[PDB]
Design a protein around this ligand. Structure first.
Ligand SMILES: O=C(O)C[C@H](NC(=O)CP(=O)(O)O)C(=O)O
Ligand SMILES: O=C(O)C[C@H](NC(=O)CP(=O)(O)O)C(=O)O
Ligand SMILES: O=C(O)C[C@H](NC(=O)CP(=O)(O)O)C(=O)O
Lengths: 306, 306, 307
């Protein structure tokens, strides 16, 4: 039961917990459609703390807490007393004095788990540098299930920057709970990390690397595209060399399975042609909307109403 | 007839639409003044996306949502994934997955309508560069009609930067829905733009230019003062010639009519002196307050609860 | 008695019965909050949060307070507002009070808050004016002192660090004179307690003594009130790094402290209280912060005519 627990890492997620949570997510989405009265989190305040920029992850948590009848406390680093020199631990300790939950994204990996040590209320990891994005894995798995019917028996193809990409890290790890085959399409420099490729191996999930998107596609049921993480590179030179390696265009999606989904945790810069947007296999915006409902489910369960 | 519609341009309003909207706004303002329950928009969510700075337009939409029982997602460029390089089009379609209505201010003219072209939720233009500001002009006509009892049969003198002023572009072109006269008092390099002038001329309203506040004033019912837009200038030299030229003072006012109002979208820098504000004809603080109630009407009707 | 509609700018305007009532109402709301009693006492009502200097506790605990009463909150920061377009302070404040029923304002120029409230139609609450006052941090400081030790009377409080720049130590020292207290002061000569304050504290008849170090000041301390060396106000960095870190509280110093005693800090801290002190029961600085939410719920409720 997720009640009152730190949500730090995909590891802790039982298959039973995820399915409880997919179910509550489908319930909460029904009531929003039915224009039902949601006073579920009336009284409860969420502390949204972002030290690293966000659009979907911050907006999805905020919209969710609103739509459960809760309130949100906005916290950015730039206008906070961080600027007086406050430590990350003290910032988190203080925001819990006001809030029932803490959503923390931060640029340094393990910072969230480090701050969550002395935190006396549930802290949700919304991204820890290149480490992990746990609720994003959860919504991607929900979306796969939603778009195709099952997750078991599926071939997931992760393309792009796997080294920095905290979403694929979490997502690869978590897809070890489903009978899947993973394929990686990266340049040598941005290959999926060792601990991750080692973790996935030890669960038995068959990993495979490919050089291009042309090769992986015809067997790919789930095509997960990523963004060349420009702000994690040691030098632009390294970045601009890698920028634009893979570019999904409608020409490429003419040898993709009829049954098939293209995802992206967003934002995209170059890596998906806008023309792809019309193909109904493109579910990356539907992926966004799912996120709000899963995060509604997590906030309801972690605060212990569903 | 405004339900589920983008609010992009004043040329999309008719008279019935406006009169309905003002009527809903009086109706909502009374509800607020008696202190009744207001859950007109309970559960619902507005995306507040400002790419330029704002005080009035952002606060009024948010106070408006809040008094209707709704909730607001505050979005900023700076803390957003714009920084990762996400385009305006994605940003607007992604916020719509969380929200029922999108309020967009953008520094590029035509941006908001381009962003609204293929967005599936309603988008309210809250200012698109030197283009338009439809809801300001909607609350300006409201305030005029609130402060004098009519707009029909009146003369309006627009003073300041008319070339850059999106407020006056909207207001002038909308005023031609009434029986009115227009006076223009700017330096030669900031006259009203030509396409806007030809529209007014095409609809058959009097466009008369003038030399100064002194000259237009005697016969002016609405004195609409605007700011010199520093951010809109190429060279500071070109702004510092234009800056502090037209200045309203109590002495200049003694020549005005008793049945007259001075308006200003705000903020002012120096164009109206601080002594002017104690004259009951100073109707610019009541113009902002009216904007909140117009925005309430505007939201409830666009979201189909009035 | 009674702060309905009233501006909240200085602790000079507070009586004892206004504090009592406000402390009482802070307890009433806490418990209603503890019972998940579904509160909508300020449903409809809007607060404008106007911060011209950065914040964490003050902004968040005003914003949490409102939300927990059922009200709304308009966030206002200088950087992304039309302050950028030239707008002066009065205009901004006067504009936000058109939208909102109460205005909380934090500004860097001393006195700019009272001066912006002059011509304002709604209540304006001072959440900090430069190196001047911090009236609602003074109220929550005295609440925490009362809750932590059973009473404020007969206590000696010791204030430590940057007394000169300390907007919260000016309010508190001034406010405390409405009890029977003995004040001890610890600061390097360049950061002593301003002369306006400590003659003001002279007048009301409250003893004052200027101790040389924490260790000397601890034996008889019932409230050790620590403060941050205020970097953003100094000359001159050269004057800052001379002062930065000259008083630091450790678990070793504490082993001579009274048993019935508490350790307070308005926050944040940089290094003046060892993280190693946080597990110590008497370290009340986080309980002091939660307390603030409930105090500032009682402010909003009372200033808007609820209790
Ligand atoms: O940024 C990416 O490329 C992937 C991933 N994206 C997101 O979380 C979406 P957002 O940053 O808009 O909240 C991330 O790591 O932040
Ligand atoms: O900014 C001006 O001077 C005029 C006008 N002003 C406003 O809308 C006021 P604000 O920027 O505070 O929303 C505009 O078109 O931006
Ligand atoms: O910052 C201090 O040292 C004391 C005092 N602190 C506060 O008010 C807390 P905050 O800045 O997080 O609102 C201040 O003067 O700002």
């Amino acid at each position: 039961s997720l009640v009152g627990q730190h949500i730090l890492s995909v590891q802790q997620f039982t298959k039973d917990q995820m399915s409880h949570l997919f179910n509550v997510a489908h319930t909460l989405r029904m009531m929003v459609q039915k224009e039902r009265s949601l006073d579920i989190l009336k009284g409860k305040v969420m502390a949204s703390m972002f030290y690293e920029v966000s659009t979907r992850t911050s907006s999805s948590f905020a919209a969710a807490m609103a739509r459960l009848g809760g309130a949100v406390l906005s916290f950015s680093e730039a206008t906070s007393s961080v600027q007086k020199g406050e430590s990350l631990a003290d910032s988190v300790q203080t925001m819990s004095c006001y809030a029932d939950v803490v959503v923390l994204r931060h640029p340094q990996p393990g910072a969230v788990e480090l701050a969550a040590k002395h935190c006396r209320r549930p802290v949700i990891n919304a991204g820890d540098g290149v480490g992990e994005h746990p609720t994003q894995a959860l919504l991607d798995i929900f979306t796969i299930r939603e778009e195709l019917g099952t997750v078991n028996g599926m071939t997931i193809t992760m393309v792009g920057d796997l080294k920095h990409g905290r979403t694929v890290h979490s997502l690869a790890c978590l897809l070890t709970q489903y009978r899947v085959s993973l394929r990686y399409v990266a340049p040598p420099s941005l290959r999926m990390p060792p601990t991750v490729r080692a973790f996935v191996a030890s669960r038995g999930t068959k990993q495979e690397e490919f050089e291009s998107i042309e090769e992986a596609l015809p067997d790919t049921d789930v095509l997960y595209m990523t963004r060349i993480q420009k702000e994690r590179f040691g030098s632009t030179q390294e970045y601009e060399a890698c920028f634009g390696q893979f570019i999904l265009t409608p020409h490429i999606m003419t040898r993709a399975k009829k049954k098939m989904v293209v995802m992206h945790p967003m934002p995209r810069v170059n890596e998906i042609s806008v023309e792809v947007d019309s193909d109904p296999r493109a579910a990356y915006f539907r992926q966004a909307e799912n996120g709000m409902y899963i995060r509604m489910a997590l906030l309801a369960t972690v605060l212990g109403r569903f």
